[PDB]
Amino acid sequence: SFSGYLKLTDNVYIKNADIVEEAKKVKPTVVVNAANVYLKHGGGVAGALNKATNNAMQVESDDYIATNGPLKVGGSCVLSGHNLAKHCLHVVGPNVNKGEDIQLLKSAYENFNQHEVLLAPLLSAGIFGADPIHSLRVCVDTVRTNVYLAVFDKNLYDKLVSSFL
Ligand SMILES: O=C(O)Cn1cc(Br)cn1
DSSP states (O other): OOOSOEEOSSSEEEEEOOHHHHHHHHOOSEEEEEOOTTOOOOSHHHHHHHHHTTTHHHHHHHHHHHHHOOOOTTOEEEEEOTTTOSEEEEEOOOOGGGTOOTTHHHHHHHGGGGSSEEEEOOTTOGGGOOOHHHHHHHHHHHOOSEEEEEESOHHHHHHHHHHOO
8 A cells, every 4th residue: 555645636646756666665556657659668767667577577568569569659558567566557658859749648647547546657757758747737637546656856746746736
């Protein structure tokens, strides 16, 4: 069970935490990965979660891509959570650094509604280049299931809490 989270709404919770460390502690049913369409877990949250699985997430993801092809921006797939969670929900938020449509962020968060409870990062934040304040707004206005957000950066966490409407 999740501890130390600030409650933002009926169903959205937030904590300044490293999502890999949080996943190892909680062992949630679902950990969300900040995936790209190719499931190439190189950096940000994806690189960190993959390294914590000793690259097993990448090996499983390469088999998934070989069979199914790439995901869509805004889409997701459920794969194993390995040593971190029961499942990993790989969600592709739009990457502003690839010129992707920020309007797809709501579609990306809709994937969370297929899971009653999730440990997640803010979609499209960090190396995906979107405004994290707007990502949190889309999260609370889209996700209806119980989402526990892990914000890696303390300054960003404090700014997200202090500016939350
Ligand atoms: O804090 C987050 O979860 C997203 N992020 C912002 C920076 Br700076 C580094 N990562």
